[PDB]
Enzyme design. Structure first.
Site, PDB file in Angstrom:
ATOM      1  N   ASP A   1       0.800  -1.231   0.000  1.00 16.20           N
ATOM      2  CA  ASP A   1       0.000   0.000   0.000  1.00 16.20           C
ATOM      3  C   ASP A   1       0.822   1.265   0.000  1.00 16.20           C
ATOM      4  OD1 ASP A   1      -1.927   1.999   0.392  1.00 16.20           O
ATOM      5  OD2 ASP A   1      -2.842   0.993   2.167  1.00 16.20           O
ATOM      6  N   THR A   2       1.021   1.882  -1.174  1.00  9.68           N
ATOM      7  CA  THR A   2       1.822   3.086  -1.243  1.00  9.68           C
ATOM      8  C   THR A   2       1.153   4.285  -0.578  1.00  9.68           C
ATOM      9  OG1 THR A   2       0.961   3.567  -3.454  1.00  9.68           O
ATOM     10  CG2 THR A   2       3.000   2.280  -3.284  1.00  9.68           C
ATOM     11  N   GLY A   3      -0.136   4.187  -0.303  1.00  9.56           N
ATOM     12  CA  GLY A   3      -0.927   5.186   0.366  1.00  9.56           C
ATOM     13  C   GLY A   3      -0.867   5.108   1.878  1.00  9.56           C
TER      14      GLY A   3
END
Ligand SMILES: [Cl-]
Ligand SMILES: [Cl-]
Ligand SMILES: [Cl-]
Ligand SMILES: [Cl-]
Ligand SMILES: [Cl-]
Ligand SMILES: [Cl-]
Ligand code: NA
Lengths: 99, 5, 99
Positions: free
Chosen positions: C25-27
């Site tokens: 999850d880059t968020g």
């Protein structure tokens, strides 16, 4: 480009004629933008994550320019704490995770 | 606060 | 590996000798996993997600394998819809976003 993940992967987007900053979020199925007006029809939706669910408006066939690349898809609008570009549009710009 | 989305 | 985003970027992780599924999850600033037993002391942390803020338990210097790549770092434990690998460990395994 190649974006490292030392910091939040923020890019400039153009949507509805407006420039906004948004987070490239591989964990997000959907693209979610802070309250704004968009043209055309919409329907309500609930989306959830850490901390629970929020109600959003679902707009289909919206064009968004993401760091210079155009894509079309569904955009959700509602009280998100950050503008999010999710997988439905990341695929269209050819985004991959590499390691 | 840190953000997780 | 090069991971496209047409499906959720789910990988196998190993923590405390146990295999689990987790989302890249880059968020996510931080890594958060569902309730489980971790060694050592923990510290409090507040995190913001799509639907609000939550309190979690922060465990430092935890050994975790992610898609076969070794990492040692901070893991949060709390109520999450899915196990999430965030940027603090994605940087350790050398992950980048590319378009
Ligand atoms: Cl940042
Ligand atoms: Cl879409
Ligand atoms: Cl592809
Ligand atoms: Cl895929
Ligand atoms: Cl204490
Ligand atoms: Cl860490
Ligand atoms: Na539409």
């Amino acid at each position: 480009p190649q974006i490292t993940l030392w910091k939040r992967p923020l890019v400039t987007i153009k949507i509805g004629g407006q420039l906004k900053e948004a987070l490239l979020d591989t964990g997000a199925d959907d693209t979610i933008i802070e309250e704004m007006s968009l043209p055309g029809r919409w329907k309500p939706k609930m989306i959830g994550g850490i901390g629970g669910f929020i109600k959003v408006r679902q707009y289909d066939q919206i064009i968004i320019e993401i760091a210079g690349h155009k894509a079309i898809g569904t955009v959700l609008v509602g009280p998100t704490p950050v503008n999010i570009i999710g997988r439905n549009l990341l695929t269209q710009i050819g985004a991959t995770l590499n390691f | 606060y840190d953000q997780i989305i």
